[PDB]
Amino acid sequence: GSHMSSQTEHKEGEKVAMLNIPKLKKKFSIYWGADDATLKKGVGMFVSDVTTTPSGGGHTVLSGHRDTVFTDLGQLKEKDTLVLEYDNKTYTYEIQKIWITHADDRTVIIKKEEPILTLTTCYPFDYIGDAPDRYIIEAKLTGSYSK
């Protein structure tokens, strides 16, 4: 009963926002939800009754994996910033603190009464599936743009 398909409303596996890095001048496509079951997508946004998208003050969680090392040095730093594009609006975030937590850390996947961007990734080649310790990049919204 999956013959019918939908494409227009916020749906998991669909591009809803784009992640752009100014310091590293790197860009990544962020799709609604983050299905780890399939390796089709690369980066997905956590979706839960507590997790929400960055459209104006909310808990934003990013999910990704680590492949190789290139600009990781500039990625992990409070001087780095994460720009998110949503609804033709650009949100400017800034790395506040970087640490590592377990994949079962709901404290980092809870709800936030403020616009905070948290990135959780890892899935190393050494470990198959959801690595035990995932890297966490915490960032807060400093500026926002709207066109």
From TrEMBL:
The residues annotated as the active site are H65, C122
Gene Ontology MF, one: hydrolase activity
Q: Does the keyword Glycoprotein apply?
A: no
- The keyword Zinc-finger is assigned to this record: no
UniProtKB keywords: Hydrolase
Identification of the protein by name: LPXTG-site transpeptidase family protein
Q: What is the lineage of its organism?
A: Bacteria, Bacillati, Bacillota, Bacilli, Bacillales
Shown residues within the full chain: 56 to 198 of 198
